Design a protein around this ligand. Structure first.
Ligand SMILES: Nc1ncnc2c1ncn2[C@@H]1O[C@H](COP(=O)(O)OP(=O)(O)O)[C@@H](O)[C@H]1O
Ligand SMILES: Nc1ncnc2c1ncn2[C@@H]1O[C@H](COP(=O)(O)OP(=O)(O)O)[C@@H](O)[C@H]1O
Lengths: 231, 50, 148
């Protein structure tokens, strides 16, 4: 809102469960700060700016940051897959992730947190491909039914977590949230499938009632005919 | 690339659906016919025991 | 309503069965306060702001808070599931939750209360998926009958 005084030492409060990277171009010296601290630029120090993917159907270069959110969060993506039957499906998925940071004082490890430029879109496309592959070898019915075990193994190959060793990300779970045929005429063909399923249960009570009607009607006739003879 | 190929692939799935609706309707009918006979087996035996 | 005096030490009454997180950027020191107490910011201390999910069909970033309600409550969600028969169902569910806090003096445990940014939408979607999975392998009649 108001022009900042440029003669003032430039500081930044780093949020909890995050990290910034700052390089000193004069003293030729690197550092990465973790967590809830305040970081102050020197005369010639600079921040790294991270350009990240954002959006529903994730697009690169939609968000910009100075701190890397290390901490456990999720991000959500919309995929389009296709089955061995050529049924075109649209999926809502969510990825629980975090950064294992073995040693925070280790300058060689800690720099790798910033290796992969766009760690969001990297894990999206790298998982969205693992899912499109397994499901073209699987049929629709099998997938409409086992979508949860299918997708889990396509992501976690022979395994509770997918590690990405370049930067150290992991993905501990995938929540599948919606599976939909793209085309409407496919959704109609699936609509007549349930109208039948209903009539199959109404026909079964009407046939189970009739069999009980016919059983009792005979238990009377058995006695009414025996009673006439005893008279 | 071509759209008319994507149409030819579209009719491929309309069949795949009808193949599963025909299979529940044939699997229901076989269960209907099995129970209808389990009653007839008893209703006919019950008349003779009377 | 009236502009607060800025030269006044900033305090906050923390409600029962709740907790706030406050960091001191000068003395480089963290603390989490529990319960019904009053918390006063130092010269350079700050609060954590929690952005949380709210709404009928829960949307992220609809509520903002400074205290974490630890205590036993419920939240309610509307799901859409589907059966092995392709019967599309809409469910009204409610989740009774609370935070086990083993040691309140333990600074390593107590910070984890604030790890997960949006603990509401996290448990919603993580449960809404567990429900959509089992029910596509179950038929309608069986579910209309044994849904519980
Ligand atoms: N400063 C940051 N550093 C690291 N990661 C971030 C930062 N800001 C946002 N992100 C992550 O990038 C992702 C951007 O995707 P987003 O559009 O927020 O997904 P959603 O649709 O689930 O909200 C989010 O999951 C978020 O956790
Ligand atoms: N300050 C807070 N700290 C922690 N949790 C909160 C806070 N305020 C609200 N919540 C919880 O977040 C949830 C928001 O969902 P809400 O829309 O209130 O659900 P409902 O539709 O059941 O009222 C509530 O269950 C509430 O208990």
């Amino acid at each position: 809102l108001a022009p900042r005084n440029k003669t003032r030492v430039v500081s930044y409060r780093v949020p909890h469960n995050a990290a910034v990277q700052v390089y000193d171009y004069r003293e030729k010296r690197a550092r990465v700060v973790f967590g809830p601290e305040l970081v102050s630029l020197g005369p010639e120090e600079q921040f790294t700016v991270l350009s990240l993917s954002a959006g529903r159907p994730k697009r690169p270069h939609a968000r910009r940051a100075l701190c890397l959110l290390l901490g456990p969060d999720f991000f959500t993506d919309v995929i389009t897959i296709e089955t061995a039957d050529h049924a075109r499906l649209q999926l809502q998925l969510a990825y629980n992730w975090h950064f294992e940071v073995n040693d925070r004082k280790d300058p060689q490890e800690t720099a790798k947190l910033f290796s992969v430029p766009d760690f969001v879109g990297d894990a999206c496309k790298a998982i969205a491909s693992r899912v499109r592959g397994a499901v073209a070898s699987v049929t629709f019915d099998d997938f409409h039914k086992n979508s949860a075990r299918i997708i889990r193994t396509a992501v976690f190959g022979f395994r509770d977590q997918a590690v990405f060793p370049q930067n150290g990300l992991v993905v501990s779970s995938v929540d599948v949230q919606s599976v939909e045929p793209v085309d409407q005429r496919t959704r109609d063909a699936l609509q007549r499938s349930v109208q039948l399923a209903i009539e199959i249960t109404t026909n079964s009570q009407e046939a189970a009632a009739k069999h009980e009607a016919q059983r009792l009607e005979q238990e009377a006739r058995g006695r009414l005919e025996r009673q006439k003879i005893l008279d």
